[PDB]
Structure formats: structure tokens, C-alpha cells
């Protein structure tokens, strides 16, 4: 037994994780369902490394120092269950199987319980960062059986992305594949930040009438305040990018985004669990509206916008209201995301590391930002915060931004500028802060025509029915 | 050979349908799993009429004129499938099983195909109208196997509600539980119309400071214009309703909106097939946000909103702006709903008559309104209408309501009034009308941080990557 860990699945993702562990001094045993990729991978990108290979599962298991640690990077679905069924008879009680693919969390939970009964430690881990991330420092979100954490903590944290304060972007998420659920919520939050930036870029282009490189300079200055993020860095670089001829390239790009993007499952999980994750759903619906390019071309010729509009104020003042509205809406988005994480932890009985979860998103992911570090700090003070809109940093940040927040929303509404995420974040904030909501009228209606009963504000849990008619 | 139809499930919903068919000259065979309630139904609710009954499944099937027709109104889920397995051996090839409950359309599709192989005609029909409408004229949305339509056509349209033109609010909608998908979308739109009224009710109460009886009359006067609807009618009656202690009943009711499923199922279906049904999604999330009552009580104590605001306008001229915002948002809501209906017809291969669906909703159901009649004209003028906004009646109504729409949304934003459906309906319209959206940036980002590809305006179909680094 001379190899520390093994990895099944010799794809660009699996290869980079193996080379990453090799660059940190770990002997990795490579393997693939088609053994032909083993000797192929060992004589190219692994030529001259400590990486060893195996042509059978029994050989691979026999070359690992106990407790044996297997990383699965195969396609999510039946392929993962096939390798598990083929590994269980070969493993001893206490061995570790790690699924690093984009597996559905309900499957990871099922595999975690079934393998715990057989004495095998199963871990479902989320890996974000693409190929370049998996090569030098990916974001790892492990979860499942904490008994396997003391063994994989050394290798995972070593190869994980470094955040800047020395800590690794890899900690224990929770039990029964909570990391794959965290990986899902991570995908939905990505849709919000990107769409939120697009709404801000829309305001600068149609209300302030700015030029491309002038908008890129605004984002570069916006990337020096509270909005430090990789999505804003690339946004400024995209706006300033000049094609073959001096003209810019972005106005030449088609106006259609993805339609079957993975971010919708975050909003579907919100509807399944009854959590008001409104901003993520608007970002998903916004991309689907973009795919209707031909309908929007014909609609622009027939449907008209707001008449007699003119911007009276200050171009340089409105450029600071858009920023604070973009920052306040982003706070509402992450507040809803942790509400979905909280409800899932309650439904299954998980104990999530909300502070560490924000750290794992802060390095290697696309949504990485120092703003995520402030979420980590907020979850370092109470680790019981039922809502990010209930802590000092976020509560104060809205109090300064909300005045310019409503100014950007009101101006964009009268200007005819689509801001679905700006408005739904402001609508959710006003709704969440109201002790009394008009939903009592909804209950009165459902009881009126459907006799769906209702409760009294002072006597909960007791459902009564009113005649209403006679 | 004595009874025309059989109905299993002796609840107030099923009982009213039996008496509905019995008050129309049809001999209905009532049955229930707990047969004790069968004899009870024949001795009280059906005291002195031609309503018959059965004590078992064998006795029930023996009374049905061929082709035998059984209506199922049991609990959604396994209870429907259990009775199906209990009924298929007792039936002959050509008999009809009708599922009148709020069953999910994928299930109804499964029952239709599995019974298609066993020579059984399955009909998944939607029944809307509550209980009062279930006895005098409900909205029936029969779908599944059209081979069973000629035999159930006469009975369904007989008890269904009829509009001022004489046409029935019941016609064949499509194949493989297409009607249950129509019923699911129907309830999703109901979520929107109810939430839209609440956003208008909140603006009257917290911006104009109106009174309960004042807002009640305001909805009653609104009910005489373009917003003539049943939900507006009952909203005015509820606001006027006084309790036995003299006070109004509504402010005593807690603000926690429940839901039985068809709301989220509509928004989930929209996300799956990529249809921007935003307003319905916001209405469902609004009920979820209201269910967090105790969490909002603590949030109100710690979170501050806008305080430097007072309405210095005309309380009469702004009340009209709330009306146009409601009418325009209701147009965008129904536009999103039919987009979901047209995508389902594409995904599954159904032949849905969108003008007919509006007719089936033009009477009996909960979202019934004269506004749904104008939608029928929209599809009668063009049955292949790609969008409800592309119609003259609705593009002109949105144009006439646009200024008051934005004026009320802007005022509510400054006031701190939650308007999730008004705001999402306006943001969708401003987006749907723009030829150029910021989505060119959201896709240029993916090509930047990843190996993803983008298109260009002058070359649709070719995917490019740029060395941005």
C-alpha cells in the first residue's frame, strides 16, 4: 500500500484533480471504466509524476493505504451506483467512497444511508471551478458521513483553493450529501449575480446613455468597493474588449441566453420546499425570456414603451444609486439562498456549516467575492442566524442602499427598463419586513369560494369556516 | 341498464355533482368506499329524487347503461389508482373512467396509456367552480382518450355552466390528461388574480389610508368596468362582511396563505420547459412568504423601511391608477399562462384550442370574468396567435394603462408596499417589448469564464469562442 488516494474517471476534470493532488505530493492511483485511458493518461500529462495506475478495481483497491479513499468522477446517474456496487465487496469496513460529480442530492442521501449500514463511509462532495479550478485549486463542498472527514480533510483542504487568509475553501458541509445540495444552491445564486449585473448594465446603457468603455470603467471602479467580485471583473473586461476592427464585440453578440440551464433546479427546489427564493426564479425566467428573440423582435415593432420620459438629475449621481441597488439586491439574493439551505436542513435533519458554506463559494467558484466573506463573518458571530437580513453588517448595508435602491427602481420603472431581479429583491424586502400582509384576504377568498377554512390571528392552529353567503 | 353515470366519492363536491346531473334528468349511481355514507346521501341530500345507489362495485357496474361511465372524485394520488385496479376487471372494452380530481397531468397521462392498452377509455377532466358551482354549473375540462368524448359529451355539457351566447363551458381540450394540465394552469392563474387583488388592496389601505367599506365599494365600482370578475365580486363582499361582534372579520384573520399544490406545480412546470411564467411564480412565493408569519413578526421589529413618505396627490386619481395597474398586470398574467399552454402542446404534441379554453374559463370557474371573453375574441380572430400581447385589444389596453401602471408601481416602491406581482408583470412587459436585452452580457460572461460559446446577430446557428484572456 503506497498510494494515498484513488480517482475513477480520467476526464479533464478527473485528470486535473489527480495532477493537483500530485503537485501536493500525494501518490494517486488513476483508474477508468475503460482501462485504456489509464496507460494513455500515465504516459502524457502524468509522464514523470508519482501517479500510478490500475487495470482493475481489485488492483486499485489493493494499492491504497488504509483507510482506502476512492474519488468518483463519473457521469451522474446509474454510473455512480454501478461503481459503488462493484466496490463494496472489494472494500473493508471503514473505507471511503467519495462522489465528486454533479449528483442529485436525493441520490447522495440514499447512497449515504445504504453504505453506512454496510460499514462504508460515503461522501458526496461538490466541485466547482471547471478544469482550471480542478488543476490548481477547486472549491470543494464535501458532505455525507462526517466519520470520513478526519481522513479526507488532509487531502481535500490541501488541494482546495486558497481564500487568502490561509484557510482552505473546503470544510464539512453536513450529513447525507448536503454538499451536493449546497452545490445546487450555488448554481442558482450564480444566475442571480449575473442577471443582477445585466440589469445594472441595462440602466447605464439606456438611462445614462453611456459608451462601452465608459461603462467598463464604471464597473472597474465598482470592483473597488463592496462589489469586489470576479463576475464584475470579467464584466468590465468584456465591455472594453475591442474586436478585429476598433468597434466593440458585445453589441454583435446575439441576445439569447441558456434555456435548459442547471440554475432552474434551485428555483424548483424553492417551490418544492415552499421557500420564497424569488430572485433566483426571476433570473431563470429572465434567461427563458431571452430565448424568445424572434418574438421580441416582432414585439418591438408592435409593443410600445413609456411615452414622454426624460432623465432629470445627475448622470454621476445615478451611477451611485445603481451601484447601491445592485449591492442591496445581492444581499436579498443570498438571504433567500440560506433560507433554502435552512429549510432543507430542517426537512432532513441536517446540521449545516453555513459559515463554511460561504467560504467554499468564496474561492474557486465563479460567484466568489469578498462579500461572501462578510456572510462568513455574520455566521461566525451567531451560527444560529435565521436570516442574513437580521445581522449587523447586512441590516446596516440596506439602510444606506435602500434609499438609492428605490430611486433606481422608480427611475427604471418610469424609463421602461426591465429590472426583474432589482424589483423582486425590493418586493421581497418590503414583504419580509411587514408584520401584517394582505395574505389574510387570500385566506378569506379561498374560504369564500372553496371553503378551505381559515384561522384567527389570535387563535392559531384552529381552522373555522364562515358562511359568507347566508 | 337503469343509471346513466356513476360517481364514486360522496363528498360535498361529489354530492353536488350528482344532484347537478340528477336535476338535469340523468339517473346517477352514487357510491363510496364507506358505504354508510351512501345510504346517508340517499336519505338526506337526495331526499325524494331519482338518485339511486349501490352497496358494492359489482352492484354499481350492473346499473350502468353501456358504455359504462364511472366518475372518480377521490383523493388525488394512490386512491385513484387503487380504484382503477379495482375497476378494470369489472369493465368491458369500451367503458369510460373519468377522474375529476386535481391529479397531476403526468399521472393522468400514465393512466390514459396504461388503460389504453387494456381497452379502457380514461378521461382526466378538470372540475372548477368550488362547491356552489359544482351543483348548478361547473367548468369541466375533459381530456385523455377522445374515443370516450362522444359518450360523455352530452352529460358533461348538460350540467356545465353556460354563457350569454348559449355555448357550454365544457369541450374536449386534448389528449393524455391535457385537461388536467389546463386545470393546473387554471389554478396558477387563480393564484395570480388573487395576489394581484391583494397588492391593490394593500395600496389602498397603506398608501391612500382608505377604509374597509370604502375599499369594498371601490372594488364594487371596479367590477362595473373592464375588471368585471368573480374574484373582484367576492373581494368586495368579504371586505363588507361584518362579524357577530360588529367589527369586520378580515382584520381578524391571520395572514398565512395556504396552498394544496396546483400553484407550485404550475411554476415548476414553467421552469422545467423554460416558459417565463413570472407572475404566477411570484404569487406562489408570496404565499410562502406569508406562511413565515412568526419570522416576519421578528423581522418587522428589527428591519426598517421607508419612513419619509406621504401621498401628496389625488386620492381619487391615484385609485384609478391602481385599477389600470391591476388590469394591465392581469393581461400580462394571462399572456404568460397561454405561453405555458402553447409550450405544453409543443412538448407533448397536444392540439389545444386556446380560444376554447378561454370559453371554458368564461363561466363556472373561479377566474371567470368578462375579461376572459375578450381573450376568446383574441383567438377567434387568430387561433394561431403567438402571444396575447400581440393582439390589438390587449396591446391597446396595455398602452392605455401603461402610464397609470408605472405611476402606481413607482409610488408603491417609494412607500415600501410589497407589489411582487405588479412589479414582475411590468418588468416582464418592458423585457418582452425590447428587441435588445442585457442577455448578450450574461452569455458573454459564460464564454469568458468557461469554454461556452455565443452567437452573433448576423449568423444565427454558429457558436463561437473568443480568447478573452
UniProtKB/Swiss-Prot annotation, chain B:
Residues at which substrate binds: 102, 128-130, 186-187, 191, 260, 287, 446, 452
EC number(s) from the headed UniProt entry = 1.1.1.44
- InterPro entries hit by this protein: 6-PGluconate_DH-like_C_sf, 6PGD_dom2, 6PGDH_C, 6PGDH_Gnd/GntZ, 6PGDH_NADP-bd, 6PGdom_BS, NAD(P)-bd_dom_sf, Pgluconate_DH
Reactions that this protein is recorded to catalyse = 6-phospho-D-gluconate + NADP(+) = D-ribulose 5-phosphate + CO2 + NADPH
At what positions is Phosphoserine found? 56, 128
Provide an example Pfam family for this protein: NAD_binding_2
Quick one: which residues bind NADP(+)? 9-14, 32-34, 74-76, 102
One GO cellular component term: cytosol
Q: Main site of residence?
A: cytoplasm
Q: Where is the active site?
A: 183 (proton acceptor), 190 (proton donor)
GO annotation, biological process: D-gluconate metabolic process; pentose biosynthetic process; pentose-phosphate shunt; pentose-phosphate shunt, oxidative branch
Q: Where in the cell is it found?
A: Cytoplasm
Q: What class of enzyme is it?
A: oxidoreductase
The pathway to which it is assigned is: Carbohydrate degradation; pentose phosphate pathway; D-ribulose 5-phosphate from D-glucose 6-phosphate (oxidative stage): step 3/3
What GO MF terms are annotated? carbohydrate binding; carboxylic acid binding; NADP binding; phosphogluconate dehydrogenase (decarboxylating) activity
SMART domains noted in UniProt: 6PGD
SUPFAM superfamilies (UniProt xref): 6-phosphogluconate dehydrogenase C-terminal domain-like, NAD(P)-binding Rossmann-fold domains
Mind listing the UniProt keywords for this protein, alphabetically? Acetylation, Cytoplasm, Gluconate utilization, NADP, Oxidoreductase, Pentose shunt, Phosphoprotein
Which PANTHER family does this one have?
6-PHOSPHOGLUCONATE DEHYDROGENASE
Q: What does this protein do?
A: Catalyzes the oxidative decarboxylation of 6-phosphogluconate to ribulose 5-phosphate and CO(2), with concomitant reduction of NADP to NADPH.
The UniProt similarity line reads: Belongs to the 6-phosphogluconate dehydrogenase family.
Describe its assembly: Homodimer.
Please give the name of this protein. 6-phosphogluconate dehydrogenase, decarboxylating
**Which species expresses this protein natively?**
Homo sapiens
Its ancestry begins with: Eukaryota, Metazoa, Chordata, Craniata, Vertebrata
Amino acid at each position: 500500500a503506497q498510494a494515498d488516494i484513488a480517482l475513477i474517471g480520467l476526464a479533464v476534470m478527473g485528470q486535473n484533480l489527480i495532477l493537483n493532488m500530485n503537485d501536493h505530493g500525494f501518490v494517486v492511483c488513476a483508474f477508468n471504466r475503460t482501462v485504456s485511458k489509464v496507460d494513455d493518461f500515465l504516459a502524457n500529462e502524468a509522464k514523470g509524476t508519482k501517479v500510478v495506475g490500475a487495470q482493475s478495481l481489485k488492483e486499485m483497491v489493493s494499492k491504497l493505504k488504509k483507510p482506502r479513499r476512492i474519488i468518483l468522477l463519473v457521469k451522474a446517474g446509474q454510473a455512480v451506483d454501478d461503481f459503488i456496487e462493484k466496490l463494496v465487496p472489494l472494500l473493508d469496513t471503514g473505507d471511503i467512497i467519495i462522489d465528486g460529480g454533479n449528483s442529485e442530492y436525493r441520490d447522495t442521501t440514499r447512497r449515504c444511508r445504504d453504505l453506512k449500514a454496510k460499514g462504508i463511509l460515503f461522501v458526496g462532495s461538490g466541485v466547482s471551478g471547471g478544469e482550471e479550478g480542478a488543476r490548481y485549486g477547486p472549491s470543494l463542498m464535501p458532505g455525507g458521513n462526517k466519520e470520513a472527514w478526519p481522513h479526507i480533510k488532509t487531502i481535500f483542504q490541501g488541494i482546495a483553493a486558497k481564500v487568502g487568509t490561509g484557510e482552505p475553501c473546503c470544510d464539512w458541509v453536513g450529513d447525507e450529501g448536503a454538499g451536493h445540495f449546497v452545490k445546487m444552491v450555488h448554481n442558482g445564486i450564480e444566475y442571480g449575480d449575473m442577471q443582477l449585473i445585466c440589469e445594472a448594465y441595462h440602466l447605464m446603457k439606456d438611462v445614462l446613455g453611456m459608451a462601452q468603455d465608459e461603462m467598463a470603467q464604471a464597473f472597474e471602479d465598482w470592483n473597488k468597493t463592496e462589489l469586489d467580485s470576479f463576475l464584475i471583473e470579467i464584466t468590465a473586461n468584456i465591455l472594453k474588449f475591442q474586436d478585429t476592427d476598433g468597434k466593440h464585440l458585445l453589441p454583435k453578440i446575439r441576445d439569447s441566453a441558456g434555456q435548459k440551464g442547471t440554475g432552474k433546479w434551485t428555483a424548483i427546489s424553492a417551490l418544492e420546499y415552499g421557500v420564497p427564493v424569488t430572485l433566483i426564479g426571476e433570473a431563470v425566467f429572465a434567461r427563458c425570456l431571452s430565448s424568445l428573440k424572434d418574438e421580441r423582435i416582432q414585439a418591438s415593432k408592435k409593443l410600445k414603451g413609456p411615452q414622454k420620459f426624460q432623465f432629470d438629475g445627475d448622470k454621476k449621481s445615478f451611477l451611485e444609486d445603481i451601484r447601491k441597488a445592485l449591492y442591496a439586491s445581492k444581499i436579498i439574493s443570498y438571504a433567500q439562498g440560506f433560507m433554502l439551505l435552512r429549510q432543507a436542513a430542517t426537512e432532513f435533519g441536517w446540521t449545516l456549516n453555513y459559515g463554511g458554506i460561504a467560504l467554499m463559494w468564496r474561492g474557486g467558484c465563479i460567484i466568489r467575492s469578498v462579500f461572501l466573506g462578510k456572510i462568513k463573518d455574520a455566521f461566525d458571530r451567531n451560527p444560529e442566524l435565521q436570516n442574513l437580513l437580521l445581522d449587523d453588517f447586512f441590516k446596516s448595508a440596506v439602510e444606506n442602499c435602500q434609499d438609492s435602491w428605490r430611486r433606481a427602481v422608480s427611475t427604471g420603472v418610469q424609463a421602461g427598463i426591465p429590472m426583474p431581479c432589482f424589483t423582486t429583491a425590493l418586493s421581497f424586502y418590503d414583504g419580509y419586513r411587514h408584520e401584517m400582509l394582505p395574505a389574510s384576504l387570500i385566506q378569506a377568498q379561498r374560504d369564500y369560494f372553496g371553503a378551505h377554512t381559515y384561522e384567527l390571528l389570535a387563535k392559531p392552529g384552529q381552522f373555522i369556516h364562515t358562511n359568507w353567503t347566508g
